Amino acid sequence: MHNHNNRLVITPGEPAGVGPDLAITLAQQDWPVELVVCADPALLLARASQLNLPLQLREYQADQPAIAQQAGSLTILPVKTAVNVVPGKLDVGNSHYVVETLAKACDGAISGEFAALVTGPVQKSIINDAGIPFIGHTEFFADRSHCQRVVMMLATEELRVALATTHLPLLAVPGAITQASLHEVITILDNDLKTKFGITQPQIYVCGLNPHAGEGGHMGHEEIDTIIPALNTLRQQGINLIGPLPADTLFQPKYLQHADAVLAMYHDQGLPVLKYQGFGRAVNITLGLPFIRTSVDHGTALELAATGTADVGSFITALNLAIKMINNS
Amino acid sequence: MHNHNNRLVITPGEPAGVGPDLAITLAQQDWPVELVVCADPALLLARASQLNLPLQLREYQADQPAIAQQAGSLTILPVKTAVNVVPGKLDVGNSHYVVETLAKACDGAISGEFAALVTGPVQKSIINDAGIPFIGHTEFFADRSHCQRVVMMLATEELRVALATTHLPLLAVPGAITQASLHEVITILDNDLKTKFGITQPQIYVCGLNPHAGEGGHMGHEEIDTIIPALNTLRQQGINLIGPLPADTLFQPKYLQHADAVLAMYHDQGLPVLKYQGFGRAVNITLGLPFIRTSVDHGTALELAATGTADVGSFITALNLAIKMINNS
Ligand SMILES: OC[C@H]1O[C@@](CO)(O[C@H]2O[C@H](CO)[C@@H](O)[C@H](O)[C@H]2O)[C@@H](O)[C@@H]1O
Ligand SMILES: OC[C@H]1O[C@@](CO)(O[C@H]2O[C@H](CO)[C@@H](O)[C@H](O)[C@H]2O)[C@@H](O)[C@@H]1O
Ligand code: NI
Ligand code: NI
């Protein structure tokens, strides 16, 4: 989107989970944008009561100017649960409700009614148990957006890793890396660093696939046959790319500090460092969608729902990042 | 070895490299053990001159009591270079000398003449160019020790990762993990944590091979078919093992803090986090050898030889770890 307004939509997600707690907790401070929470209002107020935190919900008025959200409030875009919610207890009765809040939030983000979509956790199993096709937010938003390719990034305030491949068995990773696949992934990554993170000339640092980036062909051939040629084609199109580098070189701070994003070839090459340094404030950012979407990188934490022990760090950081992307855009 | 004396052998390694600088720099403080440096004495004194640091070499007297090394000195076990050494310039003429210092140091560590072997960097190419079979210190010491299996560990003062597999292309990793291979690797790892690190009941935490440790068979089958059964056999023999866990769970500090060592299944699953947090003070420790051996985790840094800019952190930490292993043993 070339223009962004001053309203963000938040879906708390699974009502039995901690998303509601976390939304209510986020709401105890002032924000520079309007926080439009798509959720059941009774739930939020009752969860706020269970946690002993105050909360006033303001009706969402689409035709009004955004009002920067004030401490002790949220702006509600009300959607009703079908059944009573009991914290910690999944109930198939409320899955239509969860997915409805996603649909609404996604439709808004698409049109630009909402400047960014920030998501709390949902539970795939209970959604499926209600007969609704669902894997994650990513596929639901991609399909509803008619978005043909997305790229996963995990990011903290200080470090961004994107993945060339995601939830594949290790056996399948080398075959899944092609020149075509890397072309698509890096184009999206470079495009969003510019358009979403507002970095005019992103420096993207790339991991080899093999240990020591293949050590001259002595420890694998994928760097020579596939990665290097793909990067060179992209550099011809103007994308600033350094690598491929050994992962255990690149992930030293002395080099990391130079990267705007790192592209890991596979899940466990990239995520461990981020989680190590993340202090539980890591944020999932879905690239390639036609709008800004950030997310918590934890689950529903059902056992912690309504306890006051759920950590708000991921959600606060997700919302913080969203807001910078709205602006640095 | 059931008993350790108060003498450590240091091989500075490649004379044209930074190993000599680093040895001379280590020597500017007091140590609780005797530091027997197997190297050319003219080289060390000349490198000390180039770096403007003082240095007195004490002749090594095997039949005397160890004397705790004093600041401004080393104990020399002299071995002559064949040709003049020029910092930064590899010379095939001196490779026989490098390998001779390794042989001597290794023979001593074997017999218990030396309580631990700590190695500076060597350069494989120049050793090979002189017609001498060489890959690394590890294979040279393993073969000379008649040691049938070694396990690589990278460790800092705060975190230890061992690897189930090392310098293999990613394609080869899943096939290289067997019940047999994991049995051998974990036996060695557990044995050395007890005998070398002095941890009576090591808690070893194990990564799955696949992302999310295979997610119940939905993201790979190796955890179910191979890893889990291997760990259960080992737990029957009394080895305390937690996992397999997702790498991007396990490498969070909140869980790491509980592990005495982490076993990563492959190189890039384990090393990046260690290097990230290592601040360049990471130490390679070779497990399974019949003596304690620690090492720098950097190369010869030829361009930095005699500049005073080479970082001593890895070497200081390597020597520090060696000394604790001598004692905690
Ligand atoms: O040993 C590293 C190995 O990685 C490659 C890429 O596959 O090169 C990387 O490392 C080089 C420094 O060792 C850099 O000059 C290069 O730009 C970087 O891509 C291989 O060529 C090399 O053998
Ligand atoms: O999703 C994790 C995945 O890993 C396995 C091992 O392959 O189990 C690990 O994680 C469980 C918690 O989710 C622990 O109970 C277990 O001890 C640990 O090994 C799989 O069983 C699971 O599907
Ligand atoms: Ni994942
Ligand atoms: Ni390596």
d(CA A19, CA A97): 14
Q: At A302, list the tokens.
A: 């059902």
Q: Is B2 annotated as a binding residue?
A: no
Report the alpha-carbon angle A254-A259-A264, nearest 5.
100
Within 8 A of A272 by CB-CB distance, chain B residues are 247-248, 251, 269, 272-273
Which residue's alpha carbon is at the smallest distance from atom 16 of ligand 1?
A: A243
Contact B295, B153 (CB under 8 A): no
d(CA A272, CA A278): 10
d(CA B172, CA B184): 19
**Residue B216: nearest ligand to its CA?**
2
Question: Experimentally, how was this structure solved?
Answer: X-ray
Contact B33, B326 (CB under 8 A): yes
Q: Is B146 annotated as a binding residue?
A: no
Tell me which residues of chain A, numbers 215 to 244, contact chain B at a CB-CB cutoff of 8 Å: 215, 219-222
Name the residue facing B211 among A220, A268, A279 (closest C-beta): A268
User: Mind telling me how many Å the CA of A276 is from chain B's nearest CA?
Assistant: 5
To what resolution in angstroms was this structure determined?
Answer: 1.7
Q: What are phi and psi of A121, to 5 degrees?
A: -75, 145
Within 8 A of B171 by CB-CB distance, chain A residues are 174, 220
Q: Which atom of ligand 1 is nearest to the CA of A216?
A: 23
- Residue in chain A closest to B253 (alpha carbons) equals A276
- Residue in chain A closest to B170 (alpha carbons) equals A210
User: Mind telling me how many Å the CA of A92 is from chain B's nearest CA?
Assistant: 23
A244 preceded by a cis bond (ω within 30 of 0): yes
What residues pair up with B237 in beta bridges, in sequence order? none
Name the residue facing B275 among A174, A214, A251 (closest C-beta): A251
| Strand B116-119 to A241-245 pairing | unpaired
Which residue's alpha carbon is at the smallest distance from atom 9 of ligand 2?
A: B245
Edge-first strand listing for the sheet containing B73-78? B56-59, B73-78, B34-39, B7-11, B116-119, B292-296, B283-287, B151-156, B159-163, B261-264, B204-207, B241-245
Q: What is the largest CA-CA distance in chain A?
A: 64
- What letter would DSSP give residue B224? I
d(CA B69, CA B74): 7
Residues with Cβ within 8 Å of B74's Cβ and at least 6 positions away in sequence, in order, are B10, B23, B24, B27, B35, B37, B44, B55, B57, B58
What residues pair up with B205 in beta bridges, in sequence order? B242, B262
B174 preceded by a cis bond (ω within 30 of 0): no
Name the residue facing B210 among A169, A211, A277 (closest C-beta): A169
User: Mind telling me how many Å the CA of A212 is from chain B's nearest CA?
Assistant: 8
| Strand A159-163 to B34-39 pairing | unpaired
- What letter would DSSP give residue A153? E
d(CA A271, CA B98): 40
Q: Is A212 annotated as a binding residue?
A: yes
Residue A3: other Cβ atoms inside 10 A: 7
Which residue is listed with tokens 């070339």?
Answer: A2
Cβ separation of A268 and B268 shorter than 8 Å? yes
Contact A317, A280 (CB under 8 A): no
- What letter would DSSP give residue A299? -
Q: Is B135 on the interface with A (CB under 8 A)?
A: no
What residues pair up with B156 in beta bridges, in sequence order? B159
Pocket of ligand 2 (CB under 6 A): B 208, 212-216, 223, 243-246
Name which of A119, A274, A221, A159 is nearest B168 in CA terms: A221
Q: Is A284 annotated as a binding residue?
A: yes
Q: Which of B206, B223, B228, B258 to mutate to test the pocket of ligand 2 (most atoms within 8 A of CB)?
A: B223
Q: Is A249 on the interface with B (CB under 8 A)?
A: yes
Which residue's alpha carbon is at the smallest distance from atom 20 of ligand 1?
A: A216
Cβ separation of B275 and A249 shorter than 8 Å? yes
Type of residue at A34 = E
Name the residue facing B220 among A171, A221, A272 (closest C-beta): A171
Q: Is B275 annotated as a binding residue?
A: yes
User: Mind telling me how many Å the CA of B274 is from chain A's nearest CA?
Assistant: 8
Name which of B15, B185, B170, B8 is nearest B97 in CA terms: B15
Q: Is A4 annotated as a binding residue?
A: no
What is the CA(A213)–ligand 1 centre distance, in A? 7
User: Mind telling me how many Å the CA of B158 is from chain A's nearest CA?
Assistant: 13
Domains of chain B: 1-329 (3.40.718.10)
Residue to substitute from A124, A276, A298, interface B, most B β-carbons within 10 A:
A276
d(CA A269, CA B265): 12
Give the helix, strand, coil percentages of chain B, each rounded to 5: 40, 20, 40
Cβ separation of B173 and A170 shorter than 8 Å? yes
HEC secondary structure over B139-202: HHHHHHHCCCCCEEEEEECCEEEEECCCCCCHHHHHHHCCHHHHHHHHHHHHHHHHHCCCCCCC
How many inter-chain contacts (A to B, CB under 8 Å) are there? 118
Contact B289, B324 (CB under 8 A): no
Name the residue facing B169 among A220, A273, A280 (closest C-beta): A220
